[PDB]
Amino acid sequence: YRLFRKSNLKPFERDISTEIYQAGSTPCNVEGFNCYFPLQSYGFQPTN
Amino acid sequence: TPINLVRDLPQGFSALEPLVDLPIGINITRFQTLLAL
């Protein structure tokens, strides 16, 4: 799913892009902290 | 329209009839006419 986005998507909007976000106040140009990949995976396991 | 006129647009009236609505959505802009050669 998408955890980082520059702006909220409009209803029935699809965001497939991989735009790196500047969540952290420090601008980026680029992972780990203060700017992250927009998408985030799910830990779907039967033990969950 | 019956448009042949002489020059520029005339003083008339008529209306467009819709045909289809396809579900692209996805933030449309930058319409670009396709000119031939």
From Swiss-Prot, chain A:
Changing residue 31 to K: In strain: Beta/B.1.351, Eta/B.1.525, Theta/P.3, Iota/B.1.526, B.1.1.318, Gamma/P.1, Zeta/P.2 and Mu/B.1.621; May enhance affinity to human ACE2 receptor. Residues 1-48 are annotated as: Receptor-binding motif. Changing residue 40 to Y: Reduced host ACE2-binding affinity in vitro. Disulfide bonds join 28-35. Changing residue 40 to R: In strain: Omicron/BA.1, Omicron/BA.2, Omicron/BA.2.12.1. Changing residue 25 to N: In strain: 20A.EU2, Iota/B.1.526, Omicron/BA.1, Omicron/BA.2, Omicron/BA.2.12.1, Omicron/BA.2.75, Omicron/BA.4, Omicron/BA.5, Omicron/BQ.1.1, Omicron/XBB.1.5, Omicron/EG.5.1. Attaches the virion to the cell membrane by interacting with host receptor, initiating the infection. The major receptor is host ACE2. When S2/S2' has been cleaved, binding to the receptor triggers direct fusion at the cell membrane. When S2/S2' has not been cleaved, binding to the receptor results in internalization of the virus by endocytosis using host TFRC and GRM2 and leading to fusion of the virion membrane with the host endosomal membrane. Alternatively, may use NRP1/NRP2 and integrin as entry receptors. Binds to host ACE2. RBD also interacts with the N-linked glycan on 'Asn-90' of ACE2. Cleavage of S generates a polybasic C-terminal sequence on S1 that binds to host Neuropilin-1 (NRP1) and Neuropilin-2 (NRP2) receptors. Interacts with host integrin alpha-5/beta-1 (ITGA5:ITGB1) and with ACE2 in complex with integrin alpha-5/beta-1 (ITGA5:ITGB1). May interact via cytoplasmic c-terminus with M protein. May interact (via N-terminus) with host bilirubin and biliverdin, thereby preventing antibody binding to the SARS-CoV-2 spike NTD via an allosteric mechanism. This is Spike protein S1. It comes from Severe acute respiratory syndrome coronavirus 2 (2019-nCoV).
